[PDB]
Structures are given as C-alpha cells and as structure tokens.
Design a protein around this nucleic acid. Structure first.
Ligand code: NI
Ligand code: NI
Ligand code: NI
Ligand code: NI
Length: 57
DNA sequence: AGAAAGCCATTAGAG
DNA sequence: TCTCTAATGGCTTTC
C-alpha cells in the first residue's frame, strides 16, 4: 500500500519544513489533522525530507 | 528505565 | 523501463 500525496499536501509540508526541519509533537498533531494524514506519515515525511536535505546541503 | 523519536539503508509501488 | 518517494526495519539517540 502506497498513498500519493497531493500537490497541496506536499506544498503545505514543504512550507512547514522551510521554517522547521523538526516538528514538535503538538505541531505534528495539527498538521496531520489539517492534511488528513496520520502522525506517523507526517513523522516519516519529515524524516525522508531531512535525509534529502542532507544530500543537498 | 523505557517509550518516543531519530537516523540510515533499503524496498517497492505509482505514474 | 525509468524516476521518485512513501514506507519499512533495525538500530541509535533523546528525554
Ligand atoms: Ni523564509
Ligand atoms: Ni535504555
Ligand atoms: Ni523521545
Ligand atoms: Ni519497483
């Protein structure tokens, strides 16, 4: 099973990542609810995004 | 302590 | 057949 994230979900997450590369638990809960994703998906998106951030300085 | 969260390598599924 | 990235597993680190 693999969900494709919409333009809107990816853009909202990228905009969040612009300010904070790590999330507080309280903020993770808000983003999950606003985007209709689980907290675990939000957690994994930021982990993947940080790993991609490392490979690009 | 031990649960939550992170980091890495890796997979695999959508398009 | 490609690329991209969602998603996993096994550790390590944080708190
Ligand atoms: Ni700015
Ligand atoms: Ni321990
Ligand atoms: Ni923790
Ligand atoms: Ni494949």
């Amino acid at each position: 099973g693999r969900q494709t994230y919409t333009r809107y979900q990816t853009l909202e997450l990228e905009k969040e990542f612009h300010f904070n590369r790590y999330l507080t638990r309280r903020r993770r809960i808000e983003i999950a609810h606003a985007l209709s994703l689980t907290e675990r998906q939000i957690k994994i998106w930021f982990q993947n995004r940080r790993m991609k951030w490392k490979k690009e300085n």
